[PDB]
Design an enzyme around this catalytic site. Structure first.
Site, PDB file in Angstrom:
ATOM      1  N   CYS A  41      21.354-102.493  78.596  1.00 33.17           N
ATOM      2  CA  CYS A  41      21.716-102.951  77.252  1.00 33.17           C
ATOM      3  C   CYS A  41      21.959-101.782  76.304  1.00 33.17           C
ATOM      4  O   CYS A  41      21.061-100.976  76.048  1.00 33.17           O
ATOM      5  CB  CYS A  41      20.639-103.863  76.675  1.00 33.17           C
ATOM      6  SG  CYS A  41      19.109-103.022  76.308  1.00 33.17           S
ATOM      7  N   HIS A  82      17.397 -97.888  81.996  1.00 28.56           N
ATOM      8  CA  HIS A  82      17.138 -97.947  80.563  1.00 28.56           C
ATOM      9  C   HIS A  82      17.604 -99.231  79.891  1.00 28.56           C
ATOM     10  O   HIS A  82      18.604 -99.842  80.281  1.00 28.56           O
ATOM     11  CB  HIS A  82      17.657 -96.690  79.841  1.00 28.56           C
ATOM     12  CG  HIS A  82      19.084 -96.771  79.395  1.00 28.56           C
ATOM     13  ND1 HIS A  82      19.461 -97.384  78.218  1.00 28.56           N
ATOM     14  CD2 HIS A  82      20.220 -96.282  79.945  1.00 28.56           C
ATOM     15  CE1 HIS A  82      20.771 -97.289  78.074  1.00 28.56           C
ATOM     16  NE2 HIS A  82      21.256 -96.621  79.106  1.00 28.56           N
ATOM     17  N   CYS A  83      16.851 -99.627  78.872  1.00 25.11           N
ATOM     18  CA  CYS A  83      17.127-100.839  78.128  1.00 25.11           C
ATOM     19  C   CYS A  83      16.828-100.627  76.638  1.00 25.11           C
ATOM     20  O   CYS A  83      16.797 -99.490  76.164  1.00 25.11           O
ATOM     21  CB  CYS A  83      16.292-101.980  78.704  1.00 25.11           C
ATOM     22  SG  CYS A  83      16.558-103.544  77.913  1.00 25.11           S
ATOM     23  N   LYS A  84      16.636-101.725  75.904  1.00 26.39           N
ATOM     24  CA  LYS A  84      16.211-101.677  74.509  1.00 26.39           C
ATOM     25  C   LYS A  84      14.888-100.925  74.470  1.00 26.39           C
ATOM     26  O   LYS A  84      14.843 -99.760  74.069  1.00 26.39           O
ATOM     27  CB  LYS A  84      16.023-103.093  73.961  1.00 26.39           C
ATOM     28  CG  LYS A  84      16.532-103.317  72.533  1.00 26.39           C
ATOM     29  CD  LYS A  84      17.981-103.829  72.520  1.00 26.39           C
ATOM     30  CE  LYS A  84      18.095-105.255  73.089  1.00 26.39           C
ATOM     31  NZ  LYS A  84      19.493-105.605  73.482  1.00 26.39           N
TER      32      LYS A  84
END
Length: 293
Positions: A41, A82-84
């Site tokens: 995201c 990886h994300c928020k």
């Protein structure tokens, strides 16, 4: 962080990273030319997953294939997801990878390990502190795929929803299903909407003795693959959790057994959180009845 890097970054293993100019700098020095980054995201692999939702089973197998070739080609290769905040979505893919890489035999162990490494929850509160119920289910789906379907998608099963039943209805919304509507979503598109009280694509029955509602579902198109089911309410007392609704869940049609799927409270998204357990009681369940299509 002894080296001065202030990144929200966790080595789940020595070669598997979970994280939320400084970042490019970290990988350039600690893992020069030996990293692959997964964006949830040109060493970047993108998979867009909505907050508090799951990847499709196809998204997940694509990721596993991509991760595996990178990881097996060089001992020093690392993956970084990886994300928020790098939590539930990140955990879904990392736990799946950990299962693929043989570190754990079961989803429960993989999920618990991710939670213990990434967060300060540690084992006990990991399942609902970190993951949605669908997220837990989808790592379980990957476990079943690896064990029983040779790491490939099961044979496609096509279905239609012909009924929905909700137990322990008292205290949920208006307590008789009259506030409720159900939306079926396939591949980011609404494919069916049912409004219970009105009989819009449905027919509602309230049973006060069994404290339940049963709705005949009409005009369902053929469902195939990963299906999201969302329930909405016009009531004041039913809170919206994640995904802008009271409660929802994902399932895959080809992994349904028999003519129904019954989900317990802890298996539904939003009621899985303890804060809601005064509303969704221990016997709160949602069951979908299917026909073959």
């Amino acid at each position: 962080r002894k080296d001065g890097f202030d990144l929200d970054l966790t080595y789940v293993t020595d070669h598997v990273i979970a994280m939320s100019g400084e970042v490019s700098r970290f990988f350039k020095t600690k893992h020069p030319d030996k990293f692959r980054i997964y964006n949830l995201c040109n060493h970047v692999y993108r998979v867009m997953i909505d907050d508090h939702n799951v990847p499709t089973l196809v998204d997940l197998l694509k990721f596993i294939d991509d991760a595996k070739v990178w990881m097996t080609s060089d001992p020093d290769h690392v993956i970084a997801i990886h994300c928020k905040g790098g939590k539930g979505r990140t955990g879904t893919l990392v736990s799946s990878w950990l299962l693929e890489d043989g570190k754990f035999d079961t989803a429960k162990e993989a999920l618990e390990y991710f939670g213990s490494r990434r967060t300060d929850f540690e084992v006990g509160d990991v399942f609902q502190g970190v993951f949605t119920a669908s997220q837990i289910r989808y790592v379980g789906y990957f476990e079943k795929i690896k064990k029983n379907y040779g790491g490939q998608l099961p044979p496609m099963k096509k279905l239609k929803v012909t009924g929905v039943t909700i137990t322990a209805i008292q205290g949920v919304g208006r307590g008789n299903g009259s506030d409720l509507s159900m939306q079926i979503v396939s591949e980011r598109q609404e494919v069916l909407l049912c409004k219970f009280a009105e009989g819009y694509n449905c027919a509602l029955q309230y049973d006060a003795t069994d404290d339940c509602v049963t709705c005949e579902v009409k005009n369902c198109p053929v469902l195939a693959g990963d299906i999201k089911v969302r329930f909405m309410s016009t009531s004041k007392s039913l809170p919206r959790g994640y995904d802008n609704c009271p409660f929802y869940f994902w399932f895959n049609t080809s992994l349904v057994e028999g003519d129904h799927v019954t989900l317990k409270r802890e298996e539904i998204d939003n009621p899985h959180k303890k804060k809601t357990w005064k509303i969704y009681r221990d016997n709160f369940t949602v069951k979908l009845t299917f026909s073959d299509a």
